[PDB]
Amino acid sequence: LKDVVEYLDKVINKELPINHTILGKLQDVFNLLPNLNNLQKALTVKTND
């Protein structure tokens, strides 16, 4: 996570050319963040179990 942060810095600063293929993958990393049938209590019931 460090790595990506200061990289993105180098994108807005070092002016390393925009690499779309990476940005796409970052987005795809966000699309997978669990929103958190709610999964929340779906998890709570387990941990109890």
């Binding site: 963040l33 669990p34 958190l36 998890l43 387990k46 941990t47 179990d49």
Partner: protein, 257 residues
């Protein structure tokens, strides 16, 4: 008791063609061999072109078929046509009556020929929905009335598996990995039922052991293992497996969110 074994390349070619035809249903043919009354093995598949009408009897193309047959002969793939795949995207796995008539057109070729329904869309990264079965949600269509279900398994050669291993390289990611939960439901259940089972065995050893000497007891029990050690033993796997199981989720929730 009857079953089919579906080789990997079959299954992947299957799901590929199905996912590719969405949102229209695709059909093809299944190449394999009948081991006994209780088995059908499917090693191969090839894909059947679209028709103006839906998947149906004439959708099967003789010219195309044999034209594929011989060209597989030259590759040594010679097999019977043991069944025919199909897809009912979004509708789950069942045969419409129109699916049925065609299935009959594959009965009179071979009495053991089977139908395979694949369902591309709701088959997802979790459980894959797949079905295979032959004639006489789904009960609306007479799951048991006009036809009946079968079972499915997957043949895997050693080398096959070994290729599949290197797909995911988990060497870095391990430790944030959570193994399949349902499986640890059978785990955390069957474990407990078992602990119950050997509880009263430890009970019988404490009562009998009470009124009977150790020298006499050894003669009896040396065959099996010290049911107190199945308590001491079996309690663990539940303990630590459940503690890593808890902690792993406690970390994935707060860290990953």
């Amino acid at each position: 008791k009857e079953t089919v074994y579906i080789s990997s390349i079959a299954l992947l070619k299957m799901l590929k063609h199905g996912r590719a035809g969405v949102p229209m249903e695709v059909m093809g043919l299944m190449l394999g061999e009948f081991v006994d009354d209780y088995t059908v093995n499917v090693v191969d598949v090839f894909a059947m072109p679209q028709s103006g009408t839906g998947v149906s009897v004439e959708a099967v193309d003789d010219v195309f078929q044999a034209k594929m047959m011989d060209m597989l002969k030259q590759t040594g793939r010679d097999q019977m046509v043991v069944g025919w795949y199909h897809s009912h995207p979004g509708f789950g796995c069942w045969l419409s009556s129109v699916d049925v008539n065609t299935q009959k057109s594959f009965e009179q070729l071979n009495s053991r020929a089977v139908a395979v329904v694949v369902d591309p869309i709701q088959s997802v990264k979790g459980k894959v929905v797949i079905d295979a079965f032959r004639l006489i949600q789904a009960l609306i269509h007479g799951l048991n009335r006009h036809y009946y279900s079968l079972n499915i398994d997957y043949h895997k050669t050693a080398k096959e598996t070994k290729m599949l291993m290197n797909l995911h390289k988990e060497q870095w990611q391990s430790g944030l990995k959570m193994y399949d939960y349902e499986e640890k439901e059978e785990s955390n259940l069957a474990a407990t039922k078992s602990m119950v089972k050997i509880a009263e065995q430890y009970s019988k050893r404490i009562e009998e052991e009470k009124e009977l000497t150790e020298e006499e007891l050894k003669t009896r029990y040396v065959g099996r293992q010290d049911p107190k050690k199945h308590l001491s033993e079996t309690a663990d796997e539940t303990l630590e497996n459940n503690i890593v199981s808890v902690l792993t989720a406690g970390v994935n929730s707060v860290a990953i969110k």
